[PDB]
Enzyme design. Structure first.
Site, mmCIF file in Angstrom:
data_model
loop_
_atom_site.group_PDB
_atom_site.id
_atom_site.type_symbol
_atom_site.label_atom_id
_atom_site.label_comp_id
_atom_site.label_asym_id
_atom_site.label_seq_id
_atom_site.Cartn_x
_atom_site.Cartn_y
_atom_site.Cartn_z
ATOM 1 N N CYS A 93 0.656 -1.168 0.279
ATOM 2 C CA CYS A 93 0.031 0.043 -0.169
ATOM 3 C C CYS A 93 0.843 1.328 -0.032
ATOM 4 O O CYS A 93 0.573 2.160 -0.926
ATOM 5 C CB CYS A 93 -1.045 0.208 1.456
ATOM 6 S SG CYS A 93 -1.423 -1.492 1.887
ATOM 7 N N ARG A 122 5.887 -10.947 7.360
ATOM 8 C CA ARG A 122 5.325 -10.692 8.611
ATOM 9 C C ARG A 122 5.956 -11.405 9.423
ATOM 10 O O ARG A 122 6.216 -12.743 9.152
ATOM 11 C CB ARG A 122 3.669 -10.798 8.671
ATOM 12 C CG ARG A 122 3.089 -9.869 7.527
ATOM 13 C CD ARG A 122 1.389 -10.088 7.768
ATOM 14 N NE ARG A 122 0.960 -10.442 8.935
ATOM 15 C CZ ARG A 122 0.428 -9.453 9.802
ATOM 16 N NH1 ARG A 122 0.444 -8.287 9.673
ATOM 17 N NH2 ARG A 122 0.145 -9.746 10.881
ATOM 18 N N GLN A 140 1.076 -11.532 -2.523
ATOM 19 C CA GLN A 140 -0.424 -11.499 -3.111
ATOM 20 C C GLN A 140 -0.563 -10.770 -4.374
ATOM 21 O O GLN A 140 0.147 -10.095 -4.840
ATOM 22 C CB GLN A 140 -1.197 -10.601 -2.015
ATOM 23 C CG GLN A 140 -1.272 -10.967 -0.615
ATOM 24 C CD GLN A 140 -2.285 -10.388 0.180
ATOM 25 O OE1 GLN A 140 -2.793 -9.170 0.163
ATOM 26 N NE2 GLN A 140 -2.897 -11.254 1.251
ATOM 27 N N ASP A 142 -1.769 -8.536 -5.461
ATOM 28 C CA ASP A 142 -2.320 -7.095 -4.735
ATOM 29 C C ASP A 142 -2.334 -5.787 -5.867
ATOM 30 O O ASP A 142 -1.764 -6.016 -6.982
ATOM 31 C CB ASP A 142 -1.123 -6.561 -3.850
ATOM 32 C CG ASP A 142 -1.745 -5.581 -2.824
ATOM 33 O OD1 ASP A 142 -2.903 -5.636 -2.515
ATOM 34 O OD2 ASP A 142 -0.811 -4.623 -2.623
ATOM 35 N N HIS A 144 -3.725 -1.572 -6.125
ATOM 36 C CA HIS A 144 -4.486 -0.447 -5.728
ATOM 37 C C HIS A 144 -5.040 0.532 -6.623
ATOM 38 O O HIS A 144 -4.549 0.794 -7.772
ATOM 39 C CB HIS A 144 -3.744 0.639 -5.028
ATOM 40 C CG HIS A 144 -3.068 -0.518 -3.652
ATOM 41 N ND1 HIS A 144 -2.039 -1.086 -3.788
ATOM 42 C CD2 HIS A 144 -3.519 -0.564 -2.488
ATOM 43 C CE1 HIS A 144 -1.470 -1.840 -2.791
ATOM 44 N NE2 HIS A 144 -2.913 -1.370 -1.706
ATOM 45 N N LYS A 224 -15.482 -2.997 3.711
ATOM 46 C CA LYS A 224 -14.855 -4.029 2.695
ATOM 47 C C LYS A 224 -15.809 -5.245 2.316
ATOM 48 O O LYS A 224 -16.727 -5.511 3.126
ATOM 49 C CB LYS A 224 -13.401 -4.380 3.482
ATOM 50 C CG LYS A 224 -13.920 -5.591 4.261
ATOM 51 C CD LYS A 224 -12.789 -6.250 4.930
ATOM 52 C CE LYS A 224 -12.927 -7.148 6.053
ATOM 53 N NZ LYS A 224 -11.739 -7.406 6.748
ATOM 54 N N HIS A 270 -8.335 -1.265 -2.031
ATOM 55 C CA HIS A 270 -7.248 -2.110 -1.947
ATOM 56 C C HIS A 270 -7.860 -3.631 -2.540
ATOM 57 O O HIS A 270 -9.029 -3.798 -2.092
ATOM 58 C CB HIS A 270 -6.738 -2.456 -0.379
ATOM 59 C CG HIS A 270 -6.290 -1.136 0.065
ATOM 60 N ND1 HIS A 270 -5.245 -0.912 0.844
ATOM 61 C CD2 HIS A 270 -7.271 -0.030 0.185
ATOM 62 C CE1 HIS A 270 -5.229 0.345 1.435
ATOM 63 N NE2 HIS A 270 -6.393 0.945 1.191
HETATM 64 ZN ZN LIG Z 1 -3.286 -2.343 0.153
#
Ligand SMILES: [Zn+2]
Ligand SMILES: C[C@@H](O)[C@H](N)C(=O)O
Ligand SMILES: [Zn+2]
Lengths: 401, 401
Positions: A93, A122, A140, A142, A144, A224, A270
């Site tokens: 992000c 993590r 991921q 991922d 945005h 979400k 996201h």
């Molecule tokens: Zn994000």
């Protein structure tokens, strides 16, 4: 149907204590991961997404400007250099906002869709680590989306369509949806969420998708939608997420000049469809019981000779399929044909081409599947054409089934 | 020819103070990176290499065993978790040996060529950082070849061939070679270094490659042949490296069953051709002054209308080239055609297709190259076919040149 056992039998990957929760991808497991990426990229092009790549670490100072330090501090890996602290990114992000912040942006640029396959880490408790499902290092699918509030609804419908589009490719049709609403501690006027949640619910309706609410379970920065898949044993796997964010672009000073020549802060969405790709591969491994559809199979075809008399012919055909873009391997070992077929079947190789004197004379190949099916003899190019079609369409089923 | 300036001008990438020596790849820069990756993979296939992915960090105790802690501590980023120390990897070799160690190996499995686009981090002094050439986080086009002592000659020759082969694709024909010998801080006996240095010296001589020694510059684990290429500005760039290692495999307990069924330690050859994807892209940017060959260009073709009259035809043609695998963008802005053509020329877009009412009824397109050359009206399928051939052959020159 245990991915850990299958992963070892098919030599896909392995884990060890020297790197808890971080996958050592072997050649065959990495091939599957790379084909997944190829697939996602085909959707990135289709749904018009940019693909970027951010660094793995950034000053602890920038992470503190997000809020990720309060909520994630305990999960971040930190390191340092010349007296400055850096955090190994646990998410993409902030990095994507840094890219947005480069160059003056205007309404003419929105909606701006930014995707990335960037590994995140993590510091998850070692005890909770499990195969490919719960890891420390993960990637991921991922992305945005930076947009104006007047674009949100259309953007969410875009993510909705992509979700079911990708899930259907792997044969997942049973999808449960949950729209988590405003939590007690949030950042925004009740007016804001009203519009935000409305966008999410209306978007789900424009697609005729039944859903339930997870009251007060939204993030403090926005509501979400989460999508949960069901595999063949009827187990649920939450993989999809479409998260609205009304606070991150602001904290990282993102903005653009609207059509009203003014300066506004874009809305940030996201979204991830598969979620952790390591985990997704684990789910598919169990769903297919190791019988990966041909487009994903580490090795799609093994060609074998009866005696070292068809060796030359086998190598010849192996180069042809290889130049044809098919993952093929030649088995010229001094073993009985049945021994070879047994071994490759256990390895779940989709197709096996047998080459005896008869095949050499005719310029054909005897075709068999890992399911024990005799597909008869075929011309080399017929095989190549049939395989390229099965691969190109990412067909879940093999020839004849 | 300043990659830093060109990089900002063409929106390729950017760097910022919160992450020194680490690159943020924007859409267009990442497109170039990915195409380079596709190219390297085509070579990995042709030269018969597996491709894997190792963990981002590993236990400091592993790094102590390899000798990296004693001889490489200063360049490593460290982090911790659960009372354990971890080094973010500065190299991919140890991880490759861990993968190698999974499953009994025999001489039949050698040579085993294992490649990886390895994400590495080295804590380089901040003062010495410079654009994409000197960074802290990078991606190595790395590989380790596990072989027998007898296979050393052929495997080293293979790496040498691969170096000249890849460099020629980019137009680099002037190459200088050097041999870096045992450094002050090293592991292994003087007998092992005498043997490793001789093997590499003999490989160069047998290839009739003149070379000069770089005394004391070898890796702590082995000597290395280093390849320096020259750009069009006759500037020297050290990139390629081929290293002979008789130490790390033993220290990491690697072994295989020889033909005489005796247990043996495999020899390990380390090699990177481009060095780091980041640095190589920096070099290429200056070499081409932003005019990337079409196969590498972020946007290969831009199609422009003159007025709204041709907007429909433009959209159709763009959709068509996109399906043909070409990176294309339509420019329907209400701007003078010259303004458009100028802007894209400034962006180094290889080809610009102009569509006026004539082209539309004609069913063709007016072609101009970023060098300002007018190619005239061409059949749309003719350009598609010619562009595909230019891309597929990774040609350094455009139509007509
Ligand atoms: Zn994000
Ligand atoms: C080339 C690569 O394998 C080597 N370990 C290096 O980083 O120098
Ligand atoms: Zn190495």
């Amino acid at each position: 149907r245990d991915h850990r056992k299958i992963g070892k039998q098919l030599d896909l990957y392995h884990m060890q204590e020297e790197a808890p929760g971080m996958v050592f991808w072997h050649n065959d497991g990495w091939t599957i991961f790379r084909e997944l990426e190829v697939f996602v990229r085909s959707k990135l092009k289709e749904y018009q997404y940019q693909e970027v790549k951010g660094p793995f670490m950034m000053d602890r100072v920038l992470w503190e400007k997000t809020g990720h330090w309060d909520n994630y501090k305990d999960a971040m890996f930190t390191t340092s250099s010349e007296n400055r602290e850096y955090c190994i990114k646990p998410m993409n992000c902030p990095g994507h906002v840094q890219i947005f912040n480069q160059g003056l942006k205007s309404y003419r640029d929105l909606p701006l869709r930014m995707a990335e396959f960037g590994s995140c880490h993590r510091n998850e408790p070692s005890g909770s680590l499990h195969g490919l499902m719960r890891v420390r290092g993960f990637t991921q699918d991922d992305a945005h989306i930076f947009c104006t509030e007047e674009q949100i609804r259309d953007e969410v419908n875009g993510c909705i369509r992509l979700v079911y589009d990708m899930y259907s490719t792997f044969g997942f049709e049973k999808i449960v949806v949950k729209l988590s609403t405003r939590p007690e501690k949030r950042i925004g006027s009740d007016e804001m969420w009203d519009r935000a949640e409305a966008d999410l619910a209306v978007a789900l309706e424009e697609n005729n998708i039944p859903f339930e609410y997870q009251l007060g379970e939204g993030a403090f920065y926005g509501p979400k939608i989460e999508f949960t898949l069901y595999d063949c044993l009827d187990r649920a796997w939450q993989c999809g997420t479409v998260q609205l964010d009304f606070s991150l672009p602001s904290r990282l000073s993102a903005s653009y000049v609207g059509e009203d020549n003014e300066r506004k802060v874009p809305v940030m969405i996201h979204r991830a469809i598969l979620g952790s790709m390591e985990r997704f591969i684990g789910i598919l491994t169990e769903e297919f019981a190791g019988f990966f559809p041909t487009w994903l199979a580490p090795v799609q075809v093994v060609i074998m000779n009866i005696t070292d008399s068809q060796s030359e012919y086998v190598n010849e055909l192996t180069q042809k399929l290889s130049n044809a873009g098919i993952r093929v391997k030649a088995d010229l070992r001094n073993e009985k044909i049945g021994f070879k077929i047994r071994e490759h079947t256990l390895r779940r190789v989709p197709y096996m081409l047998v080459c005896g004197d008869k095949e050499v004379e005719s310029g054909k190949v005897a075709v068999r599947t890992r399911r024990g099916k005799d597909l008869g003899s075929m011309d080399v190019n017929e095989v190549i054409e049939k395989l390229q079609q099965e691969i190109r369409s990412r067909s879940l089923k093999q020839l004849e089934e």
